[PDB]
Amino acid sequence: VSLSARAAMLNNMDSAPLSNGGDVDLYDAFYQRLLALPESASSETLKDSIYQEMNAFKDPNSGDSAFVSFEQQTAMLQNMLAKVEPGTHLYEALNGVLVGSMNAQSQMTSWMQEIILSGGENKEAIDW
């Protein structure tokens, strides 16, 4: 019932996997979610369909939504407007959701404590 040595080793651990790589994929896919429907030139239905797709794409790279709240929103919207043709109602719907989404985000309560300081800058005596 005796025994002796043999080859018994294949150890390996040099692996370095990853899963990120789809910022392109978000924009182009989303941008195609715009272009699926704007031919109708609808005023309200277009902006609210935009709001839906903006809220529901749900970004692969992170998860929470296609955009963050402000920084990503403002770049995504500025980028969205840079890509579309000014002439279309689509351009106007992106502007309208940018404006409405920004007004919701704005937190003007905090700013009201500073807007109250204003009143004018007339050269009545300073004469700059």
Query: What number of domains?
Result: 1
List the secondary-structure elements in sequence, H or E: HHHHH
Q: How many β-strands, per DSSP?
A: 0
Note the main sheet. none
Estimate the global geometry from the Cα principal axes: elongated
Structural class: mainly alpha
Number of helices: 5
- Gyration radius (Cα, Å) is 27 Å
Q: What percent of the residues sit in helical stretches (DSSP H or I)?
A: 40-55%
Distance between the termini: 108 Å
Roughly what fraction of the amino acids lie in strands?
A: under 5%
PDB class: protein binding
Keywords: controls needle assembly of T3SS, early substrate of T3SS, protein binding
Assembly: monomeric
Entry title: NMR Structure of Salmonella Type III Secretion system protein OrgC
